[PDB]
């Protein structure tokens, strides 16, 4: 039997969890022993885990836990923590892409005789990433995009979309976005068209699902993927759409999707751009119209146009935190088949690939 120990997150406002009560129940049904730290910040109530069969333990107790427990969490270790890491860990460690102090992160493992299985690079047998948050990133990005567009119909340009807060469940989010949307329509606003780039993937599907659920029909959604962008930008369709949602991270030096010249047009319709995969450290940002990474407490940034109506960007890197419960359920269920192979992790390719990758980065230190 494998023992997993779900550590409490400490990163500010991180309410997601790598295992949910549901995935815990499912692992227990397979003979796992599951410990769950009593986490202040989690969107899940600790009673949920208890009722699932988890053994509840104090927050931070992983640090003194027996060597044989596999420690599982989402976020990287606090850069401040210096003690050797003696356990096998499953987490996003953020030390494989030459991040600052990456060697020190790994030295903690080396000194400890611990092992990292990094969630960012966990790969199935067909070479695809096992678990990520793209669907809910798209769903939340579409939600905020519609909210921003609606807001613009009912408020003056000197006001911006107010601070946003996570929702306890998807229905609650949809109810609020629908309310805002219908209010905007009731003013006689032309029904908006929404252009999505990367429409066919998980992120794109998430955005589309939100749009559908708030009453936006396919007739008003322009679903673009590789074929549509292959002609090369800039695309006139972007300023012509009311809302533009970008659902694919692109960092190689190609022609941009849009630019200030194209946006500086009194006939532009576009009001709101949601760059779901925004990363201001992108070496070749194909939507070169913002430099600010916006955040929940100030979710939009002005695009400084010289003609046309007020245009704003949403460039939040934490969109899945808008719905931490569902984000966690999707993530943990995507990860579940791999977790079920942990008893055979010495031979199961998903885990062997991860150990090998860890070993290779440790060798560079
Ligand atoms: N340059 C591009 N233009 C438009 N769509 C793209 C481009 N590159 C990748 N995609 C699509 O983006 C989606 C990414 O899917 P996912 O990683 O599941 O969110 C897939 O449907 C890809 O085909």
Curated annotation (Swiss-Prot):
GO terms for molecular function: mRNA binding; saccharopine dehydrogenase (NAD+, L-lysine-forming) activity; saccharopine dehydrogenase activity. GO terms for cellular component: cytoplasm; peroxisome. It catalyses: L-saccharopine + NAD(+) + H2O = L-lysine + 2-oxoglutarate + NADH + H(+). Disulfide bonds join 203-247. Changing residue 94 to Q: Decreases the turnover number 28-fold. Decreases the turnover number 700-fold. One of its GO terms (biological process) is protein import into peroxisome matrix. Monomer. Catalyzes the NAD(+)-dependent cleavage of saccharopine to L-lysine and 2-oxoglutarate, the final step in the alpha-aminoadipate (AAA) pathway for lysine biosynthesis. Present with 111934 molecules/cell in log phase SD medium. Belongs to the AlaDH/PNT family. This is Saccharopine dehydrogenase [NAD(+), L-lysine-forming]. It comes from Saccharomyces cerevisiae (strain ATCC 204508 / S288c).
């Amino acid at each position: 039997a494998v023992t997993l120990h779900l550590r409490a997150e400490t990163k500010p406002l991180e309410a997601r969890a790598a295992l949910t009560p549901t995935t815990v129940k499912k692992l227990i049904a397979k003979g796992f022993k599951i410990y769950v730290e009593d986490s202040p910040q989690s969107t899940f109530n600790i009673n949920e885990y208890r009722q699932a069969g988890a053994i509840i333990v104090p927050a931070g107790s992983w640090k003194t836990a027996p060597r044989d427990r596999i420690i599982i969490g989402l976020k990287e270790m606090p850069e401040t923590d210096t003690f050797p890491l003696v356990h096998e860990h499953i987490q996003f460690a953020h030390c494989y892409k030459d991040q600052a102090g990456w060697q020190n992160v790994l030295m903690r493992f080396i000194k400890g005789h611990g092992t990292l299985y990094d969630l960012e690079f966990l790969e199935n047998d067909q070479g695809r990433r096992v678990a990520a948050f793209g669907f809910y990133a798209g769903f939340a990005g579409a939600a905020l995009g519609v909210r921003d567009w609606a807001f613009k119909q009912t408020h003056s340009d000197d006001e911006d979309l107010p601070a946003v807060s996570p929702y306890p469940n998807e229905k609650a989010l949809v109810k609020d976005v629908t309310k805002d949307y219908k209010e905007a329509l009731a003013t006689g606003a032309r029904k908006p068209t929404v252009l999505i780039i990367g429409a066919l993937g998980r992120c794109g599907s998430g955005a589309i699902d939100l749009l559908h659920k708030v009453g936006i029909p396919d007739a008003n959604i322009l679903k673009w993927d590789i074929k549509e962008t292959s002609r090369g930008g800039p695309f006139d369709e972007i300023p012509q759409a009311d809302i533009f949602i970008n659902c694919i991270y692109l960092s190689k030096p190609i022609a941009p999707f849009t630019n200030m010249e194209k946006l500086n047009n009194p006939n532009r319709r576009l009001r709101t751009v949601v760059d779901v995969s925004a990363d201001t450290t992108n070496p070749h940002n194909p939507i070169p119209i913002y430099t600010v990474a916006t955040v929940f407490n100030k979710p939009t940034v002005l695009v400084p146009t010289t003609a046309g109506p007020k245009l704003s960007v949403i460039s939040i890197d934490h969109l899945p935190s808008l719905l931490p419960r569902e984000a966690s359920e999707f993530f943990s269920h995507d990860l579940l088949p791999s977790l079920e192979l942990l008893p055979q992790r010495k031979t199961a390719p998903v885990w062997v690939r991860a150990k090998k990758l860890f070993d290779r980065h440790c060798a560079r230190v």
